[PDB]
Structures are given as C-alpha cells and as structure tokens.
Amino acid sequence: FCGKGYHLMSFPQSAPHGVVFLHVTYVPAQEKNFTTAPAICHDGKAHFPREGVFVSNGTHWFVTQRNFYEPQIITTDNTFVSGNCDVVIGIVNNTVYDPLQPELDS
Amino acid sequence: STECSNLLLQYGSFCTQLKRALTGIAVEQDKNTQEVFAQVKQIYKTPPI
Amino acid sequence: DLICAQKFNGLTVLPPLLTDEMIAQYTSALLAGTITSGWTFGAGPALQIPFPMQMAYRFNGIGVTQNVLYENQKLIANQFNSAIGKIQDSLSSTPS
Amino acid sequence: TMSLGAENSVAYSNNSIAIPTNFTISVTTEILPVSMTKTSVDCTMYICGD
Ligand SMILES: *[C@@H]1O[C@H](CO)[C@@H](O[C@@H]2O[C@H](CO)[C@@H](O)[C@H](O)[C@H]2NC(C)=O)[C@H](O)[C@H]1NC(C)=O
Ligand SMILES: *[C@@H]1O[C@H](CO)[C@@H](O[C@@H]2O[C@H](CO)[C@@H](O)[C@H](O)[C@H]2NC(C)=O)[C@H](O)[C@H]1NC(C)=O
Ligand SMILES: *[C@@H]1O[C@H](CO)[C@@H](O[C@@H]2O[C@H](CO)[C@@H](O)[C@H](O)[C@H]2NC(C)=O)[C@H](O)[C@H]1NC(C)=O
Ligand SMILES: *[C@@H]1O[C@H](CO)[C@@H](O[C@@H]2O[C@H](CO)[C@@H](O)[C@H](O)[C@H]2NC(C)=O)[C@H](O)[C@H]1NC(C)=O
Ligand SMILES: *[C@@H]1O[C@H](CO)[C@@H](O)[C@H](O)[C@H]1NC(C)=O
C-alpha cells in the first residue's frame, strides 16, 4: 500500500492536479542460509522463541530476530517452555542458558 | 454505402470519440490484469518434492 | 451465429494481452513464492522458510503462540487438506 | 511472446531458512491524480452565440 518492501514512512509532494508520495521502505538484503529448527529440546522440555527464530551456522544454535541476522545465545529470557520434546516434529537437542545458574554455581 | 459515409462526415468527430473511448477501455482491461496478476517480476517454482 | 452477426456489422472482440496460461503462470509463481517463502517475496528477495514455521509465524501474527501449531501440526494439516477438498467439491457442486 | 519474468526456483527444504544480514532503505514514487480542470459551459452561447 505504501511502496514495495516493509513500509517505514512516507513524504507528500504537491504536483499539478495531483500528489506524489515518496515511500521510504525497508528492503531486506544479503540473505544467508541457516539450518533452522522449530524448537529446542533441553532437560526434557521444549523451548520456543519468544520473538525470533532458531538458526544454526553449522555448529552452534542461536536465536535471532526474523528480518535481520543478529544471533544470540539461546537463554530462558528469549525462549518460553511448552510441553516435552515428544510432540514437536523437528525439535533438536541444544542447551539453553540460565543466567541464575552461574550466580548460584559460585 | 459511400454517400452514407459522406453524410456521416458532416456529424464531426463522433466516431473518433467512440473509437478513442473503446480503445481506452480495451487498454484498461489489460492494465487491470497487469495490476492484479503481474505483481512479481520473478517466476517462482515449486520444488519437485 | 451471434458472434458472426456481431462481426459482420463491425463489432469485433479483441483478445486479452495475457493468455490464460500466462495468467495461470503468474498465479503459479504467486503460489510458489507464498508457499516456499511466505510474505518475504512480496517485500524483497524471496527468503525460504519451512511451511510449518511459516504457518507458525502466521499463528503468531493472529495472537496464537507457536507451540499451539507445533503440537497440533498434523491436525492443522488435515483440517487444511479437508478444507481444500471441500472447496473443490463446493465449487463443482454449485451452479451459482 | 512476451516474457513474464526471470525464473527463480526458491531453494525450499524443511529445515533451512534464509535470514537477511543487511538492508536497503528504498524510496519509491507513487503519483496519484487528485483533481481535474474545473470547466463551466454557457449553453446558450455555445449552441447559438448571439
Ligand atoms: C558459528 O558461530 C559461532 C559463534 O559465532 C562460532 O563459534 C566460534 O568460532 C570461532 C572460530 O572457530 C572460535 O574461535 C570460537 O571459540 C567459537 N565460539 C565458541 C563459543 O565455541 C562457530 O565456529 C560458527 N560455526 C561456523 C561453521 O561458522
Ligand atoms: C535428543 O536427546 C534425546 C534424549 O536426551 C534422544 O532420545 C533418545 O534417543 C535414543 C536413540 O533413538 C533412544 O535409545 C532413547 O530411548 C531416547 N531417549 C528418550 C528420553 O527419548 C534423542 O534421540 C536426541 N535427538 C537427537 C537428534 O540426537
Ligand atoms: C542456500 O542453499 C541453496 C542450496 O541448498 C542454494 O540454492 C542454489 O543456488 C544456486 C545459485 O543460484 C543454484 O544454481 C541452485 O540451483 C540452487 N539450488 C536449489 C536446490 O535451488 C541457495 O542459493 C542458498 N542461498 C543463498 C542465499 O546462498
Ligand atoms: C550493508 O550494506 C551497506 C551498503 O548497502 C554496506 O556499506 C558499504 O560497505 C562497503 C565496504 O565496507 C563500502 O565500500 C561502501 O561504501 C558502503 N556503502 C555505504 C552506502 O555505506 C555495509 O558494509 C553492509 N554491511 C554488512 C554487514 O554487510
Ligand atoms: C525433511 O525432509 C527430508 C527428505 O525430504 C527427510 O529425510 C527429513 O526427515 C525431513 N525432516 C523433517 C524434520 O521433517
């Protein structure tokens, strides 16, 4: 409706018998392949991303926002738990970090 | 009839107006098909499986 | 003989610029981009995504968590397939 | 025969995703007519003059 791409904002310009809209949009670029999974199996629990998606560059599993590659460590703060690992098709085994664990480990 | 066309010439540019309006409608239909269906410039393919 | 009677009096029908197979090829391209890439092909380059994960994104778009889909993936797929079959039956069985 | 576009087979599989690593801020134009030329006709002067 407001240009090709994800619309950010727009500018009106007057024209003889008309209007010209300058649509400023966000276009994704320089995409990269990653191995993805629907959920992470950790301690018999299924973890799902709170706002992003699980990606893997080949060796390590991360969670990133969907429209821009920003890999982050899969923690309990950006994932939520629903059920065990027996139901989700395609769930992979990976560790999920707990920030309370180094505090109580020392 | 040639003399009927000679009498039709005295009515002015009515036939030119009707032909121009119908040509506008005819190109408008193709434009409508372009706006509805030609929304991608890449012809994507389904994988074989 | 209606078409010949129209043609003989100066009333001609111009063909459409796009044939039916080219419009069908446009719709096949739209289907392939939507199934293989989601909404990403409409906003830029087509980024591939698995269709259960795309449909989980769409559940997240309507305010339902992803685990509702991932725990019920077979049920959602069966309901979708039955609904498509019901579209084909309802279109074949209705004149209006 | 006119070409519909370039063929682009999207590399679909059930465990692969494509994530963008960059972006382009794209500005495009959309031109929309708003008004016409406002015309008035004196019907008697057009048909008959004086
Ligand atoms: C995927 O990304 C991770 C993190 O960006 C990489 O892990 C690091 O790789 C470098 C280079 O081998 C090592 O020096 C670091 O010690 C690694 N970090 C950890 C925590 O082990 C990983 O190598 C990447 N994998 C691929 C295939 O690119
Ligand atoms: C992820 O880990 C679980 C258990 O931690 C694995 O499930 C086991 O798989 C073996 C091999 O099939 C079975 O003998 C065990 O009985 C399973 N245990 C349970 C509790 O289910 C699972 O295979 C791992 N997934 C991957 C991809 O390695
Ligand atoms: C992700 O990987 C796939 C292959 O698994 C790449 O798809 C291939 O791309 C090349 C170059 O355009 C084509 O010649 C092949 O025919 C493609 N294969 C298939 C199966 O479609 C894809 O390009 C990769 N994505 C990125 C961003 O590099
Ligand atoms: C993201 O894209 C921008 C351009 O779209 C990149 O910026 C260019 O970077 C190269 C090399 O550093 C320079 O030669 C160009 O002059 C830059 N262009 C502009 C407009 O700044 C940027 O490097 C890209 N970032 C990543 C991480 O790929
Ligand atoms: C993905 O598909 C391949 C072959 O089509 C199959 O071997 C694999 O098990 C599938 N994985 C999932 C999670 O469906």
Considering only CB atoms, which chain B residues are within 8 Å of D7? 42-43, 45
Span between the terminal Cα atoms of chain B, in Å:
66
Contacts for A9 with CB less than 8 Å, ≥ 6 apart = A24
Q: Nominal resolution in Å?
A: 2.4
Region class of D5: left (phi > 0), else alpha (psi between -120 and 50), else beta? left
Which among A89, A90, A28 has a CA at the least distance from the CA of A64?
A28
- b/e map A35-56, b = 16+ CB within 10 Å: ebbbbbbbeeebbbbeebbbbb
B neighbour chains, 3+ CB pairs within 8 Å:
C, D
Kindly report each contact of residues C24-27 with a partner whose C-beta sits within 8 Å and lies 24 or more positions away, as own/partner.
Answer: C25/B43, C25/D4, C26/B37, C26/B38, C26/B39, C26/B40, C26/D4, C27/B37
Interface size between C and D, measured as CB pairs under 8 A: 37
Separation CA C96–CA D37 (nearest Å): 44
The DSSP element (H or E) to which C24 belongs, if any, is: helix C20-37
Q: Which residue type sits at A85? A: C
Q: How far is C-alpha C4 from the chain's CA centre?
A: 37
Strand order in the sheet with A92-93: A79-81, A45-49, A40-42, A92-93
Give the method of determination.
cryo-EM
Minimum CA–CA partner of C36 in chain D? D12
The neighbouring-strand residues paired with A49 are A79
Contact in structure between A27 and C43 (CB atoms under 8 Å): yes
Residue A30 sits at φ, ψ, to 5 deg, of 55, 55
Separation CA A66–CA C56 (nearest Å): 13
* Cα torsion through C59, C65, C71, C74, rounded to 10: -10
* Angle at CA of residue A87, ends C48 and C36, nearest 5°: 15
The neighbouring-strand residues paired with A79 are A49
Q: How far is C-alpha A2 from the chain's CA centre?
A: 25
Separation CA A31–CA D7 (nearest Å): 19
Ligand 4 center from residue C7 Cα (angstroms): 62
* Angle at CA of residue C74, ends C73 and C76, nearest 5°: 65
Contacts for D7 with CB less than 8 Å, ≥ 6 apart = B42, B43, B45
Q: Which residue type sits at A27? A: V
Judged by a CB distance cut-off of 8 A, whether residue A39 touches chain D is no
Which among D23, D29, C43, D32 has a CA at the least distance from the CA of A23?
D29
Separation CA C34–CA A31 (nearest Å): 18
